[PDB]
Symmetry: C3
Subunit: 129 residues, 3 copies
C-alpha cells in the first residue's frame, strides 16, 4: 500500500461508480419510456370501452323502442282491450366509470432523476489536482 496505489485505487472506484451511473440512467430512461407506453395503452382501451358502452346504450334504445312498437301493433290486431303481454322494461347499463392514467408528474420526475444522475459523474480532471 503506497500513495501511487492509493490514487490508482481512487481511479478504480471513480470509474466503477461512473460505470454504474450510466447503467442507472439507462434503467430509469427505459423505465420512463415503458410507463409512457403503459399510460397510452391503458387510456386507449378505456376510451374504447367507454365508446362501446355508449354505442351499446344507443343500440338497446332502438331495440326497446322497436319492440315497444311491435307490442302496440299486436294489441291492435288482438283486439283484447290491451290484455296481452305488457311492454317489458329492459333497464339501462350503468354509466361506465373509467380511470384515466395520468403519469405526467411521475414521468417528469424520472426525467429529472436521469438528469441529476448526470450531475453526479466524477470528472477525472478534478482528481489528482
Amino acid at each position: 500500500i503506497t500513495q501511487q496505489v492509493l490514487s490508482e485505487n481512487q481511479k478504480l472506484i471513480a470509474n466503477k461508480f461512473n460505470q454504474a451511473l450510466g447503467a442507472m440512467q439507462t434503467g430509469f430512461t427505459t423505465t420512463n419510456e415503458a410507463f409512457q407506453k403503459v399510460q397510452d395503452a391503458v387510456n386507449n382501451n378505456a376510451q374504447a370501452l367507454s365508446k362501446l358502452a355508449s354505442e351499446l346504450s344507443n343500440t338497446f334504445g332502438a331495440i326497446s323502442a322497436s319492440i315497444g312498437d311491435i307490442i302496440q301493433r299486436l294489441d291492435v290486431l288482438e283486439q283484447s282491450g290491451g290484455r296481452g303481454g305488457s311492454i317489458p322494461n329492459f333497464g339501462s347499463l350503468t354509466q361506465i366509470n373509467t380511470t384515466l392514467l395520468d403519469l405526467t408528474y411521475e414521468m417528469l420526475s424520472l426525467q429529472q432523476v436521469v438528469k441529476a444522475l448526470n450531475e453526479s459523474y466524477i470528472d477525472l480532471k478534478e482528481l489528482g489536482n
Copy 2:
C-alpha cells in the same frame, strides 16, 4: 498528488456517490408511485368491463324473452299450427376472463430498495477519523 489531495478526492467521491444515492431513491420511489396508479387504473377498468358484461347478459336475456313472447303471440294470431318463424337462438356472451393486477410484492420490494439505499449513505463523520 499529496495526502491532503488524496483525502480531498475521497470527499469528492463520497459526495458524488451520496449525490447519486438521493437521485436513485427518488427514481425508485417515483417508479413505485407510478406502479400503484397503473395497478389501480388497470383494475378499475377491468371491473367496469366485468360489470358491463353482466349487465349486457342481463339485458339480452330480457330482450330474448320479450321476442319469444312476441313470436308466441304471432302464432296465436296466425292459426297456422305453429308453422311461422321459429323462436331464434341468441346464444350467450362468453364469461369475461379479466386479469387483476396485484403488484403488492413488487411495490413492497421497491419500498425496501429505497430503504436499503438509505443505509448506503457515506457519513462524512466516519472519514478522516
Copy 3:
C-alpha cells in the same frame, strides 16, 4: 489522517458502493417483473374487450334479423299494403381499436441494466495490490 486511514476509508467507500449496487439490481429487477405483469394484464383485458365486442355484434345481428322477421309477419296479418311500422335500422358498433402493450425492448433493456450493474462491483482483491 494517515495512509492506513486513507486505505481504510477507501474500503468504506467501496463497500458502501457495492452495498448500493445490490439494491439497484433488486430495484430494476423488481421493476422489470412488474412491467411484465402490467403488460400481461393490460393485454388480457384488451383481448377480452375485443372478443366481447365481436360477440355483441353477433348478438345484435340475430336480434335485428329476428325483429325484421316479426315486422314482416305483422304486415302479412295487417294486410295494409305495408303501411305499418317500417323495419328499424339498429346501426353497428364501431370496430374496437385496442392497443396491445409490447414492452419487450424495455424489458430486455432492464435485464441488461442489472447485468451492467453487476460488472460495476468493486472487487476488494484489486484494492491494496
